[PDB]
Design a protein around this ligand. Structure first.
Ligand SMILES: CCCCCCCC/C=C\CCCCCCCCCCCCCC(=O)N[C@@H](CO[C@@H]1O[C@H](CO)[C@H](O)[C@H](OS(=O)(=O)O)[C@H]1O)[C@H](O)/C=C/CCCCCCCCCCCCC
Ligand SMILES: *[C@@H]1O[C@H](CO)[C@@H](O)[C@H](O)[C@H]1NC(C)=O
Ligand SMILES: *[C@@H]1O[C@H](CO)[C@@H](O)[C@H](O)[C@H]1NC(C)=O
Ligand SMILES: *[C@@H]1O[C@H](CO)[C@@H](O)[C@H](O)[C@H]1NC(C)=O
Lengths: 269, 98
């Protein structure tokens, strides 16, 4: 039930400067990186080769190495031929991969952003511009669609290569994907009102429950912030409650998480 | 063009005198070209590590910097970000709590 994302980031400053850097994710765990100054893709997990042989992995890498060069050349040529007539700088982002649904068929995707906006996808057997994209973009897409070889390769990669590779990843990365890491929590406040803050860090996987409580009564005015990453791929979340002077006494932060085994953290102000 | 947002927070409960890791999570900026420093008493910390830049489902970029630090009652910590969307570097101070 994981989404596998190959995230490519390409910047074209002028005719003589571009770089392309990619990162690859299974769920919220990073499996690969490929920086512009490396010839080869790096594994960021022990299990990033999945169930592929050294030989199968080399052939797949080779295909991407050819791609990176061709993509760079093709974009610059397309821009040179287009509107508003060679328009550096150019920013392109590409998001490709597959969503696994145990029991059924994976769903694949290849989406492309240009100058920060989603404009193009590969759909079925060809490229298409998406509603509201700049109309001129229809022209390079028509051009791209004349390339039968590339369309056959993209269909292979999305329909076959991606779910086969990912299935292997899921099996080979099982222990990391199912790791439990425990939250640790601490309290602070900023100030007649004050905001109590419960900081919760180091948990994995992502799903958590954090509430300010008074005894068994949930304080529903509790506000949870965004999930913020730790360097070690665990998570951080804060939960705040606005209280009046004097109300703090008898409140606690309570956290539930899969890793705790039903033993909640309860920290009383 | 989009302005970076900056959150600064600790890996473990900040206790004065105890080695910890301070994070600076920078998001929502565009274009991806960015410079990020973490500061102790206004001075660049040379041991800052940078995760790989990535982007979210909604196309916005993000990156995480982090550094070993020992919080104390006399040291301030900050993350300073330079980006074409801002005339000045944006500096956000650790709130000493996060
Ligand atoms: C994808 C899931 C697979 C799982 C693998 C997991 C491991 C991943 C690890 C790292 C991944 C790195 C991130 C990359 C993200 C995936 C990108 C998908 C695109 C791959 C396309 C592969 C095909 C390819 O390289 N095409 C290239 C080579 O074409 C070939 O050229 C040959 C001569 O040079 C021949 O013409 C050949 O024809 S044939 O008859 O001889 O066969 C033909 O197939 C082709 O040049 C590249 C095309 C670019 C496709 C990308 C289009 C981007 C969207 C366009 C928007 C443009 C907007 C701006 C325009 C001004
Ligand atoms: C292209 O752009 C880069 C900015 O990223 C800059 O170093 C340079 O001025 C340009 N390259 C040349 C020398 O034309
Ligand atoms: C990115 O790598 C390509 C392919 O080797 C190289 O030609 C290009 O100069 C690199 N870009 C930068 C900015 O180093
Ligand atoms: C890949 O899947 C699409 C439907 O999602 C289909 O139209 C296309 O024919 C498929 N290609 C191959 C080679 O299986």
């Amino acid at each position: 039930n994981y989404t596998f994302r190959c995230l490519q980031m390409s910047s074209f400053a002028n005719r003589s400067w571009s770089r392309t850097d990619s990162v690859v994710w299974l769920g919220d765990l990073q499996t690969h990186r490929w920086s512009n100054d490396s010839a080869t893709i790096s594994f960021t997990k022990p299990w990033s080769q999945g169930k592929l042989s050294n030989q199968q992995w080399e052939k797949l890498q080779h295909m991407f190495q050819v791609y990176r060069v061709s993509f760079t050349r093709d974009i610059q040529e397309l821009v040179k031929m287009m509107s508003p007539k060679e328009d550096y700088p150019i920013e392109i982002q590409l998001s490709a991969g597959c969503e696994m649904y145990p029991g059924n068929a994976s769903e694949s995707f290849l989406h492309v952003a240009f100058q920060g906006k989603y404009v193009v996808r590969f759909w079925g057997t060809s490229w298409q511009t998406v509603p509201g994209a700049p109309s001129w973009l229809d022209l390079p897409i028509k051009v791209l669609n004349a390339d039968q070889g590339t369309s056959a390769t993209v269909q292979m990669l999305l329909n076959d290569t991606c779910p086969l590779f990912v299935r292997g990843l899921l099996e080979a990365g099982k222990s990391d994907l199912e790791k439990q890491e425990k939250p640790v929590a601490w309290l602070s406040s900023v100030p007649g009102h004050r905001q109590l803050v419960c900081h919760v860090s180091g948990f994995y996987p992502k799903p958590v429950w954090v509430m300010w409580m008074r005894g068994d009564q949930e304080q529903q005015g509790t506000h949870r912030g965004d999930f913020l990453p730790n360097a070690d791929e665990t998570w951080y979340l804060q939960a705040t409650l606005d209280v009046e002077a004097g109300e703090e006494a008898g409140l606690a932060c309570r956290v539930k998480h899969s890793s705790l085994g039903g033993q909640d953290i309860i920290l009383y102000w | 063009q989009k302005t970076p947002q900056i959150q600064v927070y600790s890996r473990h409960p900040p206790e004065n005198g105890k080695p910890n890791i301070l994070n600076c999570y920078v998001t929502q900026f565009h274009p991806p070209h960015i410079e990020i420093q973490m500061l102790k008493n206004g001075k660049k910390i040379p041991k800052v590590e940078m995760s790989d830049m990535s982007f979210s489902k909604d196309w916005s970029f993000y990156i995480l910097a982090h550094t070993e630090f020992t919080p104390t009652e006399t040291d301030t910590y900050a993350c300073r970000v330079k980006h074409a969307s801002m005339a000045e570097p944006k500096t956000v101070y650790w709130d000493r709590d996060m």
